[model samples]
Target: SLQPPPQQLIVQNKTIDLPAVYQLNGGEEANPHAVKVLKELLSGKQSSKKGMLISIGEKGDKSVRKYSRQIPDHKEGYYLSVNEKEIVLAGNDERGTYYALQTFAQLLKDGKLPEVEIKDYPSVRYRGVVEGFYGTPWSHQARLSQLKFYGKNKMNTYIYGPKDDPYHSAPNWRLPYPDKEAAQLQELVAVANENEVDFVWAIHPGQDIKWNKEDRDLLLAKFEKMYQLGVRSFAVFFDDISGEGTNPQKQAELLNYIDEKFAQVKPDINQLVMCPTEYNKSWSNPNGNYLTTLGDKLNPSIQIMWTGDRVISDITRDGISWINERIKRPAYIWWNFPVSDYVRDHLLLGPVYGNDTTIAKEMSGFVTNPMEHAESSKIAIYSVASYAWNPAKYDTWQTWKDAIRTILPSAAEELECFAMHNSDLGPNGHGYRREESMDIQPAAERFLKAFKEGKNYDKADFETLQYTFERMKESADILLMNTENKPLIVEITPWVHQFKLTAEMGEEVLKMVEGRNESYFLRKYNHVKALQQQMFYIDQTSNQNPYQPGVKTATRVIKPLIDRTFATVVKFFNQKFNAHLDATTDYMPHKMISIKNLPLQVKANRVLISPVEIELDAIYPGENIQINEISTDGKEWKLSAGLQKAPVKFVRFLRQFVLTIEK
Candidate 1:
């Protein structure tokens, strides 16, 4: 016979025992199982035939039961051994396995095989769907989708703490009442167990354990019950505590106490994970070495979360690189891919970083932190995580291309450009310093011009970026109108007490820009070099000197454009506020500050003084007057020359405000 071995594989009991199959809904299921079979056959040296059959029926099939990777569109033809002319395919249940088998059968007709002889795993250990209040529906399909994706793409763990989960009010961020949530979680865990993905129970130590000692004790008991029910993972999150800065010691103590309690009662405490700060320590002031500090006191087995802003990047000045160089403590990364709604809105990119090279390496596990639509970004996650588990999983560009093909197969190259530009633009790629929102004069100006031009242009050429920009401008204007009445500052005393609500509209505008740009770049950090062109001075109008010392270039470049546009609008609305304040005090509305007293300053090299107090009005109580004075050169003045004080009936009606221009 000319044939040495067949081109298909039928994994049997000695290798992959197919247990009694249950109803695994949806065809986009079957990940880790496929991966599991591959690992087994490769390890055991099982002679795989051309057409592979991976069966999941009953309990005995528990060995291959852990693989929970989903077969995308059920196109399950990945040739594991091209030289041997053998193919492999797997599924969640028999249906998925059957489809995989069919796909493998078809692969023999094509002659070309897949890139099969490669090892893979995950970069971050925990990767799953993060359930926010709005998007995630409490169900099994969602959990299964997440588990399947994790297994297929080498993701090992999942964080499933969510609203309505009966554990929200708990100390660690778990729902208060887990009796109801536990039942659902139990089923999900069983699915996950067989799928080969770990379920990490997220806990908030500061609040859940801090509110009441007795309540905390009760929750601890409840957690014990959950452990008995097969829950293996725990996360101590400290993100939403209002008790921060009040007492760092107290906060640290509470976390330590929780750590002790978990170890004392729960034997499964070794699988414990905790987030120990209000925010990621890398960006925030005086980065607290929480892991080492907490370990010194409570002996917590901690891991760091990758929120992009926290770690930046591995190679670039981003999350990975920062952590690589700075992180001395033994830790793992929680790979969080930023998302807005459940869907993957490309506008929410974050800072770019090095390749996810964990597939071949065990040092880091690439966890995909996602929103409700966990499955939406499954492929994108796969492409990224594949490299995290193994450094050279594939070329990063090819990985992104695989994801792009799922959405825009034809315009793959254009989408590639858009993605590259988006990441290089800001902190999270585009949103970092894009001068977003109505605060920036240039953003508004650009929007206006684009809107006007749109009237003449055809719809065919319109891009998502342009469309989003237009909508954002409309929204920004509405926000500005709503915030017109809000006082920016209240001058209670001459020089001491000042409470200022700094330009809300302007802030919102910048936030909007950051959000959109960050989202777009989050997925395209593969070809890191391609994003170099996207980096430039945020404000072309400003005379920015990035090379200059003792200057905040990012802030300087942006503040000029935003302050001018937003401050101007504020002045117009402030006049109306002043008129109202005047009418209440003197029963007449008139000017308070003259042109000479306009809150304006011109500087040479630096902003020696920024006069933010623009418009003023007062409610006088007695027969008093308000004085208005602009002293450009106070020492040169004859005390009577420049000072102008105005009198009114209501003493509350204020007088002239003094301006102390600083050097």
Candidate 2:
């Protein structure tokens, strides 16, 4: 049995003989291959030995008798102990053994062991994040921002590849090897290393060369190139093309073939991470998600990805235990936010998803998927990523507050209050109507009260949270009472949409839970949470909670009618324009007039697209743009594959067609 170490350790020194502590220096000097292993052991002062200069396991210590017996079967890790005559070093895995050795080194360094006994274990077994080529001019900024964010936060484990971005596409992989971008990734790693960050290199199958026998061989060969370049850990996105349902028997056949390939390459691979793609979702089964299915079929060497929460908001309370039981592998956060606009638009700037480390103990590591968008949301996401890295030692809110303060020192206190209040915007409702508790009116009242009192208070306390709520309500009432600010109510429309989306989604989610459909419930829950997240992103709370239920109901019904009315009105104007253009074309036939100059047709109003769209949305513009084939309108003018490469325009001469409106 291991006992407490002594208060001090003394090293045996001679004129030429290396001191007992020299063992530590030697171990580090001999093998730089495993620094993390060494660091983990050295950091634990409570885990040193006594008397024994250096304890060698499986081999006898010259000064202390070493137990040359078989190592004990521990669940995960192992360690060693030392006394006057003997040293008992035990570890289940290399990491555990290394940590034990580090303890021995500490004893050697002190000469005599300190009075300490520590039976240690990892807080979270799964610790890592995703990695890939993010070195584009626009996205590289996002990547560097993420590295800064992760370092400042506690996330340590890195995933192997880009998380669902265009870079993961084959055409983009070649970009990194190019002179301009290759150094970018290397520089990112260098900077991250300076901050004590670990990066896991994520590699995808299928797209690299497509999943065939020859391609598999070629890709397996590529691992050597990566390994030689000092890459550790492997992240496989087997979820995309690696699953069975997509290819059925062929997929099963392919998976077996790939498993063999993995065995060949895995010995060289240090940390293995992979995703079968089924994360927290309604359809995911506790008994059988993709991770389990793959583990059952193949190796459990790879860590799976998680979004930190499922259909349930409480991960530490509910989800982690179930996930641990089900997945059977170390879990890493495939953190959905960092730079993901999808998450920024959906999950309230990571307040709910990013900061929750309920299972920080169970997590293997955290890596953020900043996605492709380069924006301030990246800052928000990376802030959470940093927290995910080292939750055991970090205060998520405080860490963010400090970072915010670094950017704006004087505003730190106020920002801290804001950050805390933002996190509290969860569903707070009556027990019977649990979702209804998230009423922003009360919250608004709460925030205003908090802000007013906050000016007087140096630090934020629970008392401040209560006081602020009341102050905000009073402030809002004052605003409403003031005749001068009545027009300001119209400026509050965006907040209304946010709350509307939040409330509507919450109602639907309750039904999902009532039905006991975990998957659907989580789906609906995430949807609304995201809507609420959007509300939080642009400081929606900066304004009053203007979401009036009565106003919403009326507007909801009236908006469609108004939209149609506007459409008809626009059509009438287009018809008038098309008529004028046609007359001009008729009068100036020699001048080759465009009928588009005539009164535009009402139907043609649909074709009048706007180049100047507003900036309030997170949606991609391509979604708003039109696309069609020659078949849709039976016209050659409709966009074809070749024409799409450049650009095309049509329907400018609409009134001429209307004038020739045969029928």
Candidate 3:
């Protein structure tokens, strides 16, 4: 029943229940964190004799070194043995000992200890998360909760780098954190240490870092401040920069300086990690020596971060091979998944897939970039932890199911149903996508085909369609009704509401196809159209960040099925009846292609052009939406967008996503 199942487990028996009282041995020698956890679990009234003896210690404790072979000789590794009279725990190191306790806790299901011998270690050394996503960072409370979750999953690292945290990046990188924020970070570090998790403080200075000694000293000073706040693990992020900051030679020089100045001199601080400007293969220039310069010039000990083949991509053996060769060391992978910054309106509540299991040894570390919604993000984060810990034994769907159960045991089935349809990111700037609604995709295809050809349907396919749609409706209801796990419900309330509407629309689709009445059909058709509009509006407005805004679910299969089916049915009805009411196709506008910085989007009548990050030279070919002034008032953009607009039209003639609105 162990998740990320132990490396080696031999179970003779697992039926014994724990006694009401127990003797705690090696309480002083073991890690205080681990010891405290044990004490909390065993408040079952103590006894000196006629009770089971619970023994725990690290290999460094000398007394437990006698059982050296029993413990796996790996970092964060542990050995556990449970018999009728005694429960023994051994760790290779303090972290390992703490992990032994975690494994022991997992074994104690329903207050019963399983008789088993476990020798376990993680596949990757730095298996954890990087809050390196854009938008609102996790709150202090949420960060504390995540540390505990990481400990439970045996994930060891947590890189702190929220893209919007001004103190962590440009403009304010020189200044220390304001007192209130500083205190929260300090508390976060303490909790992380308690869970044997590395609280890695990452600095994102590449956006505006100067090559001069003053800025170099400022970077070092920042590291010193973080170290004082108990951050022993540090990272310098040089990703997503331009101008002088993008120079590989300058970056190499700065990184080498930090590696030498702080990492070497401070024995307690872990070796440095850096997120390079050339973070992914797609962006890597063929002849340009950006990655090469850093690889050759930077210190070997400082780990370099890569985002597989794209900004958001799956890890692969080939990807590892390509990066590791250039980086000189195994590339520290910063996986961007379940991070909905680019696709702000969608939830990535699917199983972790596409990471090649064979490449466990090929990469130095694997850390995920999580979404801003901490509770919701746990679904993927949990699976990522499981995958990183034991990729060899990782069961993608099984891990995903387990994660759902772990999040909310009472509503696992409901959550699973909701998640299956809500997995894929809808048409984001990044082409990355997940296989969502897979179980019902064949049925959907058949249903669409049947509709196309005189609307034929196999009974089996029809039954599948009915059952899937009904379950979707039921699941949405159950999720909405349940008051349990209120925090999660709050975080995902908008998506759940939209899903309910989507499900109702699905029911209408089935109803319209199966029945024959013009008035009823017309009434139902209007209702479904209204529902589609509501869902579209929800997608457009909810979680409205400048980056890929809105909420979208069932985008891959279910949404398309509904859209195509409804449109086709309406077309048939219109042709047969000789009436005219436009079939509602996908309720979205034309995209302004590849506009990374500028905010230009269409909403109904006006083309709202927020010239926030726009440059005068970067003005596009939008003739209809004329700009009188793109002036700024220090904080926000003060622009006058004159609407001489024609119908919605986008023509990409010039560079940088042009929305040519001709009058």
Candidate 4:
């Protein structure tokens, strides 16, 4: 389990039956939620005389009270003890007490409440998500639901900074939020407090604001609005924008001003966090950059956000030390794995990776930038929570399984299979360049290899392979139709359909080999190829995506396999029927391309055309493919050979595909 094991665990020989009544000593008054949770856990499952006494604040060991005073740079830690007769849960404060109860909840849910004593605390103080991405932000309702999730997982923070939220970004920077938005923010703040999670309302005002007293006051007033709505923590982001017109000293002074003012009026406010324009080592020079200037000028108490070496790259321990030396303070990590903004078409179901276990001790906090696909983001978010809570004790793959089991308990196996294929991330399609698991593609490869290498002598062997693909098909159908997160189904529907088609294609190929019927084989092959091409076309050309404004089909993974399968089926069919086939030209060459700027016009049949760049998979040798002419219309028109690339504009093409050519 990526879940941090207890700090101290002891085993005893005693076992006790369920108690009829579980008495709360000081828990009811100290932390009612903790009491409520215990009641839920014990409901209809307990029975007896005086039952078991579960003491909270007053009755625990006195030494544990040291946790009560605000610990320096650490989370609210707790101590729990249990015996045949009683159980005691204690924390330095209410949050600590609540967290102890949370640990108990995990054990109780897993049915592991044997008699034992355990003390626990997080290795990192700030463990949570920053809803900090571009494109459609999660609805307020979704944000509220995630708060409950974070609370359940023992996370301590959530920074609200969706780039599209006007109040958080441009246009509404100086304006107060309207009543509806303010009401939502107020409820979010109140709920987050009840859940013991800090709601850090962050704003990005560095786009066009000046560093004058008026602008400073405007920034303070913006935070004050959130403060009025019961927010106690805040942030200012200057990321993704140029620092050409801004002054570093002035920016630091602005941050210092906000911190001082908040401290003056709402002294209970947590430390202010600022995301600098130059947020990574790639942007920061060693000698003195904005980070150094801000580090020297800003108040030491303020926290600065760092994104490792690149905007969306891994964080290593050595990298942390190198950057920390220049900043002269512990950096609050804004880790950027699993944020699918760049490749909005795909969803990341991979574990929270690229973070070194050794970096936990050197950092002040850790927060991930999640994909706009909020429900789909939970699996990765859960792992991030596990990682930040106990980096040293975290197991990447185990934690990934635990998260799947936690989030999609009913469909864990099916979701796990789907994630294995789609979890890959990188340059051509997604963000980085790493392939974790090959999903069902490996099964198809093995079957093909065995059949070709030795004619694989048994009916049972082919049947088993068919059965596996059938199972994958069933899994995809279930995920698309019945997962708890319905939005996840929508985000992954295309991929699910693709998986189903691939599985079916594998089954058809097996039948073609066994039956050896030429017409049947050709029919199945052509039909399967048509379906695959449709999936390719939809993936390449569709712009009306539900999750984000732009989407990439991730053909980088799917195309190679499809091409190989097509070639294999063609070759085998030729041997069976004593015929020759041009597999390349027979199957259409389709690609999704992103075009830059184009001029506007009304409908025109022969519209002028220019494509900034066209992305096509590497072609098989000796195939002639050509991009005939461009059309602004949706019809699949095959243009005659030989129109050179030229300028063209028309009313938007219902869709556009770059013409292909054989070099």
Best by lDDT: 3
Worst 10 residues of 3 by lDDT: 646-655
lDDT of 3 by residue, 510-589 (tens): 78887698988988888887886787778666766665666667788987888888888888888989988667554434
Per-prediction CA RMSD (Å): 17.0, 17.5, 6.6, 7.3
Judging by TM-score against the true structure, name the best candidate: 3
Error of 3 at 412 (Å): 0.5
lDDT of 4 by residue, 16-132 (tens): 444556665664466677667766777644434366776676223353344343222234777677777777777756677778778777666344466767766788888899999
Q: What are the runs in model 2 whose C-alpha is more than 4 Å off?
A: 1-122, 126-128, 131-138, 141-154, 163-167, 170-176, 190-196, 205-211, 239-268, 285-292, 308-327, 343-363, 371-403, 406-410, 414-663
- Give me the runs in candidate 4 sitting further than 4 Å from their true place: 12-14, 42-49, 58-74, 109-112, 243-246, 285-288, 429-431, 438-468, 509-515, 536-559, 571-663
> For model 1, how does the per-residue alpha-carbon lDDT over 1-663 read when each residue is reduced to its tens digit?
001011234332222222122222122333455444434433323424323333332111442333333222221122221222222333334434432433333233233333332111222334344442223443566567567655544445666656434454343343344566667778888877766556777654454354556655665665666676678766656554555422345545655565676754666554555554533445444555543444355443455444444432332234444443433433355544433332211232222235444322222334545433343344446555444533443455555555544334444443333333222122333232322222233444553344334333233222333443344334333323333212110100100010001122234333332333433322222111121111211111122322211111212223233344333323433453442211110011212333444332212222111122222233222211124422122232112121133221111112233322212
| CA lDDT of every candidate | 0.38, 0.39, 0.81, 0.69
Worst 10 residues of 2 by lDDT: 581-590
Cα-based TM-score, every candidate: 0.46, 0.45, 0.89, 0.82
